[PDB]
Write a protein that binds this ligand. Structure first.
Ligand code: CLA
Ligand code: CLA
Ligand code: CLA
Ligand code: CLA
Ligand code: CLA
Ligand code: CLA
Ligand code: CLA
Ligand code: CLA
Ligand SMILES: CC1=C(/C=C/C(C)=C/C=C/C(C)=C/C=C/C=C(C)/C=C/C=C(C)/C=C/C2=C(C)CCCC2(C)C)C(C)(C)CCC1
Ligand SMILES: CC1=C(/C=C/C(C)=C/C=C/C(C)=C/C=C/C=C(C)/C=C/C=C(C)/C=C/C2=C(C)CCCC2(C)C)C(C)(C)CCC1
Ligand code: SF4
Ligand code: SF4
Ligand SMILES: [Ca+2]
Ligand SMILES: [Ca+2]
Lengths: 30, 37, 80, 73, 138, 153, 153, 30, 37
């Protein structure tokens, strides 16, 4: 099986592609 | 919808958000955006 | 505003008028001393009350007195 | 009324504690000097002074309190 | 209020809401040489060639700036003027109120704030009781 | 490539144009909160501010309160939230009575006596409504769980 | 030492300046009720007037009603109070529709059609909210008693 | 002991020093 | 907080009023007063 906190760790790690995707898409919008 | 896997509350909160909050917020922001100025 | 009073014992040494940060004081002509000048306090609504003018006065006891009173925006030194 | 029976044994109660913060432990701890409510033990000595100057009933103190309300008025 | 502003990068020390609700102060000085001064708000700036216009929030900051313009520069900048500008719009003229700096006797100023006695002949508070005054101003 | 300029091109105001204070996302987000959104009447922005705080204040006493270990767990939280929204609206209206007595312009519709009174009214309605709707979801939590999982569908 | 002068220094207006009608306490108190307080928008003064009356109207049917000797004692009082606030707001809006149809000035923001409509809206919201909050305290009276005495603390 | 209505009688009597104290303090404020 | 003495409901109503209504009302009136004009 898999741990409870590994899922939340994956979520807080994937918060970094969220920020970088937001900033890349904003910079493409220019 | 029981969840045997780890963090079963996480789909419980993320299916309403991706089903409603993401569409309502995204269409609201896009509706303000495409109709601005 | 604070009131800055200059008394007869002034020797016109100019120390108070250049020790003052806000340049409230200024020297005016006078006939009562060798230096032929006495300090005056024209723009005394700009006095903050720092008393650097009293600190610089050489005459004993004091030829310049600051009498702290009704505070305002100018006399409290508030940038906000 | 109770204190002027045996002033040596009973502690004089000043007033009653009423605050909503008290837990069960504090209510049972502050129930003292023969009361049901939580009470404060009087250390001002007004009980001894009232007993010495001849006041021996709660109605005498109530009449004194209303009289002093009228005097303050 | 003519003058290009100094090349300053901005700072948190500076003009709060006091500047646009009540008075703020402008110091205007002219220098031939470009150099570096310490703003009393904190930091360092660039003196432009010719006229400068620096907006500050206190009179003490403007006079502290003018003081360091006078004493910290070998080509002393003494033609500095300090204004008090209001958000309503009008501009007052404050520090060199006469022609010459206050240390020098202009011989056309008026002796105000001068008492005709020393502190020993100051009246005493028992004489002025319930008079609405205080022992200096009698 | 400097990212910290002065605020709004003014180098003597006491503010820097940092990536948090004066970014594009911050301008579009802080400038679109109800306290700053353009064109809204004060009643609707006060209403939207109020609901965001009534729904918030339910939780702290519900999970951490004198009643959190009893059967009236949510009623104590709701009572505490109504107490806080009551004193919040009293403070808001007192602030309106105090600050906006000398006559001012109408550049912003919120910074005036009628505007702040509308804001306080909207804040009260929204705050008590948000508090009661969070109480209603929390009291009927079995129902919300069952409908999000599909126990009744 | 005369305490009854004429009203506002005018000896021909039909009013006396008695210690009840025109005292300092009366001026500061009547003149600071929501119907007379300065600077308020009509919505907030109507809201504050409304809550003071919704909280009031709960009691008379709760303690003296056809349902006062049953298990639905507070529900009957709440139903009666909503009926009364409904007809009160209908009367208020009808008064606004009737009185403020000929165009008048804006010396007082409440005595105009938009102002009275805002007052009626605020009165409705406040009245029904005050009625329901008095119902909520009365229905949950064991909880309020226990938290004021310390049965759960 | 003491009666229930004696306490309320004391309260409504002490309502008179309340009024007179309010009026004395108001008159001192002049 | 039971009350054995006479009128036990009277502290029940007067501790909230002197604890909240007297401070909230007094500080509200004083806040309007010290900041008036
Ligand atoms: C593009 C790839 C991909 C796709 C097709 C999906 C699809 C799905 N995910 Mg997601 N997920 C992915 C990436 C992906 N995921 C990644 C990378 C993570 C790791 C952090 C997760 C973490 C995850 C969680 C924790 C949960 C799901 C859930 C779900 C389901 C419902 C959608 C939802 O609630 O969104 C939630 C989505 C997120 C929280 C993050 C998704 C971000 C992706 C990368 C966006 C991709 C952008 C797109 C390509 C353009 C659905 C099966 C739910 C589920 O299984 O319920 C049964 C749920 O609870 N996902
Ligand atoms: C992909 C997302 C998705 C999800 C998660 C849902 C989920 C739901 N649907 Mg829906 N549906 C969707 C897409 C979705 N649907 C689409 C695309 C269609 C169109 C074909 C439909 C068509 C459909 C119909 C026609 C109906 C449902 C209904 C239902 C609900 C059944 C249980 C119920 O009574 O809920 C009750 C309702 C809710 C839980 C909605 C949430 C409202 C409460 C008050 C939560 C809000 C909390 C608070 C007020 C705000 C909080 C703010 C927050 C920031 C904290 C369930 C929640 C049924 C229903 O009852 O709908 C109401 C039903 O009749 N759906
Ligand atoms: C002292 C700190 C503290 C404490 C103890 C709590 C405690 C609580 N908060 Mg809170 N909160 C706090 C600080 C805190 N909060 C802070 C700092 C904020 C940010 C400003 C929040 C924001 C927040 C939100 C936004 C919500 C909570 C919720 C809750 C409750 C979740 C646990 C529970 O049993 O609810 C049971 C769990 C639920 C009821 C989950 C429901 C979540 C939503 C409604 C379902 C998704 C539907 C979707 C949003 C519908 C909207 C769109 C639709 C209309 C189309 C709990 C009482 C929830 C709450 O009050 O629910 C009534 C919730 O929604 N709080
Ligand atoms: C007998 C007249 C009377 C009555 C019934 C009320 C009734 C009420 N007023 Mg009040 N008000 C009055 C006179 C009165 N007012 C006076 C003379 C002032 C002018 C200073 C105010 C100024 C005032 C403010 C600024 C606000 C209220 C609001 C309220 C509501 C709840 C809070 C409250 O005051 O607790 C009930 C109070 C009493 C039973 C005693 C009333 C007498 C004192 C002077 C009230 C003072 C209120 C105080 C400044 C702040 C409220 C305290 C409270 C939160 C504990 C309620 C409808 C608040 C509200 O919800 O409005 C939307 C609000 O924001 N009032
Ligand atoms: C026909 C005449 C009549 C009748 C039968 C009643 C009957 C009632 N009234 Mg009412 N009332 C009337 C006329 C009448 N009223 C008049 C003429 C007015 C003056 C305009 C009032 C003003 C009045 C008030 C102000 C209140 C009552 C209350 C009540 C109830 C008290 C008895 C009970 O069981 O409540 C149980 C007893 C309580 C719930 C006591 C609670 C008292 C407060 C809330 C506790 C103290 C906390 C404090 C105030 C918090 C505020 C500040 C905080 C936010 C910081 C009862 C239903 C109370 C009520 O409705 O409560 C819901 C109450 O608070 N009435
Ligand atoms: C089909 C249309 C329709 C409907 C759904 C309503 C619905 C409502 N109106 Mg109404 N209204 C309408 C047409 C309608 N209106 C017309 C044509 C007039 C112009 C004369 C009014 C004037 C009116 C007033 C002045 C007020 C309402 C308000 C109300 C609310 C509750 C009271 C009520 O009227 O009972 C429900 C009524 C019906 C189902 C029948 C509607 C048709 C008649 C003509 C309504 C007449 C209302 C009457 C003058 C006073 C209300 C009576 C009520 C208290 C029993 C409710 C939302 C009141 C409210 O709460 O507003 C905040 C309010 O103050 N209305
Ligand atoms: C200055 C004298 C004095 C002091 C220190 C107190 C102190 C106290 N009284 Mg009070 N009380 C006094 C005078 C005094 N009282 C008088 C003269 C009366 C007779 C009418 C009462 C009637 C009385 C009642 C009925 C109750 C208390 C209660 C209380 C307690 C909480 C406060 C409260 O609820 O206020 C309530 C206060 C009043 C209703 C009136 C007080 C008015 C005084 C004279 C103001 C003095 C002004 C000050 C000197 C400035 C606390 C022990 C409560 C208690 O014992 O709970 C356990 C309570 O239920 N008092
Ligand atoms: C001297 C006065 C005093 C009194 C009587 C209280 C009493 C109370 N405190 Mg408090 N406290 C005080 C001073 C006081 N405190 C001070 C000075 C401090 C700071 C150090 C604190 C710190 C403190 C904290 C941090 C907490 C308490 C809490 C509690 C409450 C515990 C039970 C509960 O859940 O209540 C629930 C709340 C209430 C009963 C408030 C009244 C609100 C309801 C809705 C009544 C209002 C009725 C209606 C809306 C308006 C009626 C108007 C009227 C005119 C009729 C209790 C009522 C606890 C709590 O739950 O607080 C919410 C808690 O968490 N207190
Ligand atoms: C996102 C984000 C954020 C935020 C956070 C959060 C978490 C939020 C919160 C939120 C919230 C907090 C929300 C809430 C909501 C609410 C609601 C939605 C409510 C509603 C209400 C209602 C429903 C009401 C109504 C009523 C009733 C019911 C009755 C009474 C009256 C009235 C009418 C009013 C941040 C900043 C970080 C930034 C980033 C992003
Ligand atoms: C003092 C005095 C007086 C008076 C008397 C009395 C006794 C009064 C009454 C009072 C009252 C009678 C009060 C009341 C209060 C109320 C309240 C405080 C309420 C609140 C409300 C709320 C809470 C609401 C909210 C909401 C909700 C909940 C939901 C729905 C919606 C809304 C949002 C609205 C006289 C004249 C003699 C004079 C002298 C002094
Ligand atoms: S410092 Fe004293 S002595 Fe010298 S000029 Fe000033 S007042 Fe006169
Ligand atoms: S107190 Fe300070 S500012 Fe005022 S005159 Fe004296 S030295 Fe100048
Ligand atoms: Ca507990
Ligand atoms: Ca019956």
């Amino acid at each position: 099986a898999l741990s409870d906190t590994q899922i939340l760790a994956a979520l807080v790690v994937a918060l970094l592609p969220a920020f970088l995707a937001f900033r890349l898409s904003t910079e493409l919008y220019k | 919808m029981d969840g045997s896997y780890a963090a079963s509350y996480l789909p419980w909160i993320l299916i309403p958000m991706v089903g409603w909050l993401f569409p309502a917020v995204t269409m609201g922001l896009l509706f303000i955006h495409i109709e601005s100025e | 505003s604070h009131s800055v009073k200059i008394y007869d014992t002034c020797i016109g040494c100019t120390q108070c008028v250049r020790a003052c940060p806000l340049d409230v004081l200024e020297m005016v002509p006078w006939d009562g001393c060798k230096a032929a000048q006495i300090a005056s306090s024209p723009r005394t609504e700009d006095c903050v009350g720092c008393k650097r003018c009293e600190t610089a006065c050489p005459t004993d006891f004091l030829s310049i007195r600051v009498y702290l009173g009704a505070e305002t925006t100018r006399s409290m030194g508030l940038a906000y | 009324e109770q204190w002027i029976k045996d002033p040596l044994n009973i502690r004089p109660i000043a007033h009653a504690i009423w605050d909503p913060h008290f837990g069960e432990g504090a209510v049972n701890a502050f129930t003292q000097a023969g009361a049901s409510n939580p009470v404060n033990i009087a250390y001002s000595g007004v009980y001894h002074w009232f007993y010495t100057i001849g006041m021996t009933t709660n109605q005498e103190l109530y009449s004194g309190a209303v009289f002093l309300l009228v005097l303050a008025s | 209020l003519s003058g290009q502003p100094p090349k300053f990068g901005g700072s948190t020390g500076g003009l709060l809401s006091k500047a646009n609700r009540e008075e703020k102060y402008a110091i205007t000085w002219t220098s031939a040489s470009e150099q570096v001064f310490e703003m009393p708000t904190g930091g360092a700036a660039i003196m432009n060639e010719g006229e400068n216009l620096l907006y500050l929030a206190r009179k003490e900051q403007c006079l502290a700036l003018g003081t360091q313009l006078r004493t910290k520069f070998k080509p002393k900048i003494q033609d500095y003027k300090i204004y008090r500008v209001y958000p309503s719009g009008e501009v007052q003229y404050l520090h060199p109120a006469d022609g010459v700096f206050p240390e020098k006797v202009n011989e056309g100023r008026e002796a105000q704030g001068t008492k005709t006695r020393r502190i020993g002949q100051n009246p005493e508070p028992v004489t002025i009781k319930f008079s609405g005054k205080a022992p200096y101003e009698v | 490539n400097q990212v910290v300029q002065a605020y709004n091109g003014d180098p003597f105001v006491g503010h820097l144009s940092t990536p948090i204070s004066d970014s594009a996302f911050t301008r579009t987000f802080i400038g679109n909160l109800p306290a700053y959104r353009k064109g809204l009447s004060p009643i609707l922005r006060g209403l939207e501010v109020g609901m965001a705080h009534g729904y918030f204040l339910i939780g702290p006493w519900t999970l951490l309160g004198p009643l959190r270990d009893s059967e009236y767990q949510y009623i104590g939280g709701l009572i505490g939230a109504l107490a806080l929204i009551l004193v919040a609206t009293a403070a808001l209206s007192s602030y309106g009575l105090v600050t906006f007595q000398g006559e001012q312009g109408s550049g912003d519709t919120l910074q005036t006596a009628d505007g702040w009174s509308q804001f306080a009214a909207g804040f009260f309605v929204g705050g008590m409504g948000g508090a009661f709707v969070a109480y209603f979801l929390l009291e009927n939590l079995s129902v919300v769980d069952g409908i999000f999982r599909g126990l009744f569908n």
